[PDB]
Design a protein around this ligand. Sequence first.
Ligand SMILES: Nc1nc2c(ncn2[C@@H]2O[C@@H]3COP(=O)(O)O[C@H]4[C@@H](O)[C@H](n5cnc6c(=O)[nH]c(N)nc65)O[C@@H]4COP(=O)(O)O[C@H]3[C@H]2O)c(=O)[nH]1
Ligand SMILES: Nc1nc2c(ncn2[C@@H]2O[C@@H]3COP(=O)(O)O[C@H]4[C@@H](O)[C@H](n5cnc6c(=O)[nH]c(N)nc65)O[C@@H]4COP(=O)(O)O[C@H]3[C@H]2O)c(=O)[nH]1
Ligand SMILES: [Mg+2]
Ligand SMILES: [Mg+2]
Lengths: 153, 156
Amino acid sequence: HALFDPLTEALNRRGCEQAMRDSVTAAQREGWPFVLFVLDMDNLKPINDRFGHLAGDRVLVRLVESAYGWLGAQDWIGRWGGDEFLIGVHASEDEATLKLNQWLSMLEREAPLHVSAGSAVCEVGIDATELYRRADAAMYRAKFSGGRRLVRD
Amino acid sequence: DLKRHALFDPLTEALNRRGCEQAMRDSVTAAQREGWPFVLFVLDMDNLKPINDRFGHLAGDRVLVRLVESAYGWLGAQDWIGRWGGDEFLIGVHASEDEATLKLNQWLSMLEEAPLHVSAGSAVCEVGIDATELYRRADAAMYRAKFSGGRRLVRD
Ligand SMILES: Nc1nc2c(ncn2[C@@H]2O[C@@H]3COP(=O)(O)O[C@H]4[C@@H](O)[C@H](n5cnc6c(=O)[nH]c(N)nc65)O[C@@H]4COP(=O)(O)O[C@H]3[C@H]2O)c(=O)[nH]1
Ligand SMILES: Nc1nc2c(ncn2[C@@H]2O[C@@H]3COP(=O)(O)O[C@H]4[C@@H](O)[C@H](n5cnc6c(=O)[nH]c(N)nc65)O[C@@H]4COP(=O)(O)O[C@H]3[C@H]2O)c(=O)[nH]1
Ligand SMILES: [Mg+2]
Ligand SMILES: [Mg+2]
């Protein structure tokens, strides 16, 4: 399906781009809060080497399925590509971040998944590209400081 | 005709992933059997994204094209360059480690038109070591370079 990743059923790259545009438009038109997360796996390659790529595929599927487990009606999760994902949550930073962190903590428990993540909060007067740039930059700070963490913009 | 479409990356003209895997296999075999030296490099760009952001993807495409183009400018007749995918590349050099490494650093210095920043890792083929293992060593070395600040080459 267009806009959807065949393996995980999360949105695909073009799905992510459209979702970001629609979520930012919604925040600015409906007044809804919006937090964008950029996630990059830290240990999928070693999981693939140790248990095989099918095990790795399962890990990605689990990641997305479990996310759909707490994401709301207007929320979303998309696969940017490879082992990199984006998550859009229409809630306060407090709520969004607490749920995301608890979710990531749960995933560190069958092959444990380690994730580097960054977040950015939608604000009036910002466009989707700039929001993405902020969340993306935060993710790299998380990544290079060791991973297995969420750094806020 | 068939092979070229099956083993080469259309955009850059470097080998594609299938080509990288077959090139690594052949290079290790030649090293283990024919006895010549072989050094494998794993490279990952550090600053391509900002280039796309301000200049567009066509400009970024040109960066990848120039990278491979310049490589073919010094690579030997039996050496090779492949695109693992995205902005990640592998280079196979059938020469002694010193020669291979010196040639690579000289090339990366030249690239550092928009300047290119690259994280690189190398591994040398030795008896008892297969292609998958050689790749793992070079790959791990690249990651050490990347997390140490990038724009450098780390050896296994
Ligand atoms: N398997 C797979 N993974 C994907 C795909 N799209 C995105 N990713 C994953 O997401 C990361 C960042 O992608 P990006 O934001 O487009 O940021 C990219 C992009 O700006 C640039 N880049 C990569 N390939 C090309 C290309 O063919 N043309 C141009 N202009 N830029 C490229 O380099 C940046 C980093 O690339 P990576 O290190 O590979 O890191 C990539 C990759 O791990 C995909 O279609 N398939
Ligand atoms: N655009 C593009 N880029 C490519 C492609 N193939 C490789 N790359 C680039 O090369 C990096 C390492 O790829 P890998 O060795 O397969 O190592 C991969 C792989 O072991 C795993 N992975 C990614 N996607 C999948 C998947 O669908 N299934 C499984 N089992 N593992 C995956 O995560 C590792 C790192 O992925 P990345 O962070 O994305 O980082 C990727 C990506 O930046 C491609 O077809 N298209
Ligand atoms: Mg990744
Ligand atoms: Mg890369």
